[PDB]
Design a protein around this ligand. Sequence first.
Ligand code: HEM
Ligand code: HEM
Lengths: 418, 98, 270, 32, 56, 47, 440, 55, 51
Amino acid sequence: PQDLEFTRLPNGLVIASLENYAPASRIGLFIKAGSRYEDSNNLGTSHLLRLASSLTTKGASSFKITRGIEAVGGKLSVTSTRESMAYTVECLRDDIEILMEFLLNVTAAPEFRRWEVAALQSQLRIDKAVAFQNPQAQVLENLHAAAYRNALANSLYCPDYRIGKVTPDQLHYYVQNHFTSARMALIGLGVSHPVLKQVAERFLNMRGGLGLSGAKAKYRGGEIRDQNGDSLVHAALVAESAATGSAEANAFSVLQHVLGAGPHVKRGSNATSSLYQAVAKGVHQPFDVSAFNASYSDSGLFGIYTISQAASAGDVIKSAYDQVKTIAQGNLSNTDVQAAKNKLKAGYLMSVESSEGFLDEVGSQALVAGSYVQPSTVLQQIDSVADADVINAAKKFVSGRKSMAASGNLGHTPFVDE
Amino acid sequence: WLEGIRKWYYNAAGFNKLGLMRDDTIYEDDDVKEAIRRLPENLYNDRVFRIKRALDLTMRQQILPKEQWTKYEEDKFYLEPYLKEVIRERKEREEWAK
Amino acid sequence: LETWNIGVVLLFTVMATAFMGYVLPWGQMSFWGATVITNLLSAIPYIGTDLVEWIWGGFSVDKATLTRFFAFHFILPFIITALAAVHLLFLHETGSNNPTGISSDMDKIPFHPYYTIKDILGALFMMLILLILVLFSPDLLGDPDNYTPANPLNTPPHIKPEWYFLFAYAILRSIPNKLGGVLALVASILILILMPMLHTSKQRSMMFRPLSQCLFWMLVADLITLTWIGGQPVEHPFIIIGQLASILYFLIILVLMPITSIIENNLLKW
Amino acid sequence: SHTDIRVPDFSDYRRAEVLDSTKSSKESSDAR
Amino acid sequence: TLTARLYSLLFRRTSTFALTIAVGALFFERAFDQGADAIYEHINQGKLWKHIKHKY
Amino acid sequence: AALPATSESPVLDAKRSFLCRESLSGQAAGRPLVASVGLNVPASVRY
Amino acid sequence: ATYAQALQSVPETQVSQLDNGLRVASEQSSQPTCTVGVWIDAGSRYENEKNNGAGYFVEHLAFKGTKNRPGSALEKEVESMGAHLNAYSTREHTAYYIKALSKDLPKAVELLADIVQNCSLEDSQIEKERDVILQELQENDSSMRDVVFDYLHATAFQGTPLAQSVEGPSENVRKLSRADLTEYVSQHYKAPRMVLAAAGGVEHRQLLDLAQKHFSSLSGTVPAFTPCRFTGSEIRHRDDALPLAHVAIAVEGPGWANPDNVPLQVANAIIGHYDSTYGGGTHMSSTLASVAATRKLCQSFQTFNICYAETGLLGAHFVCDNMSIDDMMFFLQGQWMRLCTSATESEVVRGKNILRNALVSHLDGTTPVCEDIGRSLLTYGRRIPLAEWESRIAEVDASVVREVCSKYFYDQCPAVAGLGPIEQLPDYNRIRSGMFWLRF
Amino acid sequence: MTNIRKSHPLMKIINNAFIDLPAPSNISSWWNFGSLLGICLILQILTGLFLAMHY
Amino acid sequence: LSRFLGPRYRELARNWIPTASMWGAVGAVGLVWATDWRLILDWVPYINGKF
Ligand code: HEM
Ligand code: HEM
């Protein structure tokens, strides 16, 4: 099924293509354009930009894009993290030229007409309310606001006061400063490399440079508490860990899977999760606990996420934190680290099974590192991680300053200091 | 000269005697309604006051002083591009519908 | 559209009412006008004669026709009242047009103080004209021969319908063919239903359209010509005058007005 | 508790064509 | 069944339903008037002008 | 797109309750959240 | 490839059988991970009113211990290799599967055989799962879509075992004993009704050797299936405390093996789906989606083709505020009628493209392919290749769509479920009249 | 707690048609002939009925 | 007109032609029946007896 072909053009744009010969083709344009590039004056600009695909472009009207992508059964999706924006077109392999022209019009020639932009402010409210129906969305937003001072402190969602105020000039300035060639990677699964090169030649010649150089994320170490009475309390307690793609980051991944990083068995007991066992020793109420890992280009957050009854919130949090401290005290066997490595490696290989997952991995790799590495190298990097590296990471979390975000009835929730 | 006839007709039409521009007098169908809805707010407010003043003038069966009349060479076709774009979108929808 | 179409319906119904009411005095003009305009319905192919004899209730205009015309004349204005109510219902969905042809929502006023008093003064003026007619020239707009009782064995030397039919009468007398004449007479009112489809101007009103005003006043003068001609005998000068007047009537509405509006559009660079 | 909801038996009102639960009701639909 | 066939052929579409109703109205008027008239002239047999006209 | 999405999006609608530890299991977050929108697909969030 | 050569290059599902009648099916790739599972022809439609819920209860107890792996030991083993154990139950099918590394397939296969063959069904665990299942019933009550589809099944298939819910009524949950569950497993977990599927980096010969080493004990070489009458009917649960109303309307659609399914799916793609978080809104080719976006008539709508062996639910589910239900019905039924009488070729082309895209995009990853293999061998006795699905889609036109939507939708009695502030949900006679057109 | 002219169901529609109806501030005498017609109609029904008492 | 024409509208015409001609036959039969138009009715076998 051929081999991944990865090249970097003189404009700095990256193009990577794997022709797997699958009936469907998937093309993603990955850009360093997340909400970490906003400042205090244009918060929510990139959220409206995420919602702004399928608006009129210089080469195709809004009706043309909607109707002409639905005609071929195609899909146009925009997925944002705090650091990246990925624009994906997926369709059958015979219709990829139409979808690629649409994608290139969307990213390189956006028009941001004032009436279409003013008729899109309502979906900021709709989109954010739908996301905030999950109690974790706002807890993670508050955790980033309380862990950072400036850059990663920015929400993926528009501030409520900024809704109805994100202007077309903010969108134009944003695209002109973040959608540049040396910040972009076009990655096609199920396409030929020369085709992607011709696509990258017909467009994507904005500046061939680095655009606006966003600020370094500054650790804050604060606490945000959202009393809202919800039956459950969601609490996140983190410290600064490491930037993505390092030996320390891999140690933090192994530590996440030592502590427990989500369930493997349906309705199970999370037996191999040491955090879960520590909490279930004393907390006989319904609960969930996992280790939380958030790695970024210039920083990272490692800690614990707990969901519990309002009454038992403190007991769950103290139990989890003391289990982490016990790992920091050098109590960590080789079998548990082998099991954690197996979990991590299996999860990594399973994430790239789908075309969406493999495309996302290749795109993030091309943005963060500017190079592609096969899963075998990733797995042996996981293998290289030693026991002392895990013990460390846990020490760094324990000794590190903490940021906390909780939501629910917090009358029994501790503070960062207690 | 075509422009002699054009300026003659602009004087004879006489909406300039009311302070109106040509695009103020257009019959408001659905295309024109969307075109007016897409105007920037300053142009919309100018249009609204111009039209209100002209209605106030015709209510008295009066016209403005000749100094205040819209000069033919100063008539701003402010609504023309918005209307052309609205009509282009309608025409595209219809071409799709066939 | 909806109020204009209701108005066309109202025009036809008012004409039917007035026509049937004019027969009620049973004078010479009543009888012979009913005779001519009912016999116009025989020109309909196949079912025409049966339709006329059924409307008559007999072989000619006679007792059955008079009593049924009284009944229809009594009932029709109430149908007109309902149609005028529907008319106003449709009109209030948009409000009124205005002389500039421009939407005026930024300058609306309450109806009561302003247009109740304006409509009342208009009503007083209408009453003045009507009372001058009633109290000073009661017979100015009528024919002396309707003061003679109807005589089925003696046709009046002239048979002219009421003045407010004469234009259509002139139109119907212009074309020799019976059925084509009737079709032209009906088209001279059904053509009002074509005005929206024939509108090619960028502007709603003719306030800023000098050439369309010229054509409009030609159409008014031509309708006055047709009224005069329909009041005159079918003789040498009046035949050719009425024929050219009818052709002009249709050629303005269907041809000259849209082309002239297109020319005006181009003169305004749109 | 929504799984505790059962439609009541409508056999008393049913047409004879559809009294059996084990039969396709399409096979009588046209006739019905 | 017969009613399944009638529905499938003549009742499913409203235009064909209406055509069946129109043709049936014509044939029903004919047959119903014929039957009702025969009943009325049997009840009143010999009493009507038609029954006795052939003597005059 | 062609496929409907594991979950459609009612705003102003209570989603689901969690009453058991078995249901609560997996609801804790482990990775930073991503936000996804789509022309013809339900919007999603992931943690 | 040109999508015609790419379909022809898709790997072939290899199928074998054990002497006991267990079918073994695998689609191989070069991926370093696999999904392997057991799909069983067992569901709630196989349960009567006294046993209803037993299959869900057995799925609940599946991973809680076998005679070889007591309690958490099994879970530990799965978790100790990075694998993921999952299970599900429907009214007709039950599945237990593992996502593992390709080198873990032997153990995974072993772990599955044990799970289906030697579940402990311990009474203490049965009581703990009784409590869990009651709490999950109350959790499912909170999901308006799940409730409205249970209601739709209950009224459409009233008097039949297809009206039953998967979980059963809470009274059965409280009353089911170990003897009930052992009887359910002994009568439904049989080799002739099971399929061992595997998709991914799995060689068929090796999987077959594993199945012969771990499943050969199973039943060698009987109550199963009665047809389920469909009923035009409505069930309306009014709760004006609910912010949004859910409405599900379905006619009797075809069963699994009926070719009419392919045109009908095409037709559903013409109507499409929508929710208020869509980019396209007013510009969508689906008329209902564009009207719903322009007028804000609903929060979402979806078409569905639920299939059982011999019947199914063909219809639509929508969510809207109290004052728009009527509109949502009017525009939805109208679309149905517009398809029955005036389908039109270009939107049939669009719907065909949508269907091909749905079929190809769905089969992305080892787990969807493993489910496709298992469920396909249960419903068709075969894995239908995507080239065949494409052949069946290519033979659809507007005449075919008009004919099949006429056969299933036009002048048919629907089954209707309403939940919430549904006072404006139209009366059943009005909906039934909306199922035909007088102009036509 | 309410103006009868706006609350009462018959007065509501009379009010909306002839009192509180927004009318253009600049409609001329040519716009009077609607009400005139409505008056003419009424006159014809009145006189006519009194004529019908003897005809 | 321009907004009309095109393959889709000609296909709609073809789709509705059977229904239109069926309603035409319905109107024809109903008009023949209501007015007792013998010009056609004299050819209908049993109805022929009514004249
Ligand atoms: C029974 C006789 C009629 C009555 C009582 C009547 C009544 C009215 C009234 C009261 C108005 C509002 C006031 C006005 O603008 O004049 C009006 C407006 C109107 N009528 Fe009539 N009308 C009648 C006949 C007609 C006829 C014959 C037509 C022509 C087809 C017509 C078309 C209109 C139109 C288009 C308007 C709106 C005019 C505008 O706002 O610019 N009506 N009618
Ligand atoms: C639309 C409103 C009406 C119009 C346009 C109208 C018109 C006419 C006309 C032109 C005449 C003949 C006048 C003449 O003798 O020269 C007449 C006569 C008559 N009308 Fe009316 N009429 C209307 C309403 C009514 C109504 C509603 C009635 C009955 C209540 C009525 C009763 C009569 C009677 C009895 C006559 C015969 C006596 C007479 O000649 O004056 N009219 N009508």
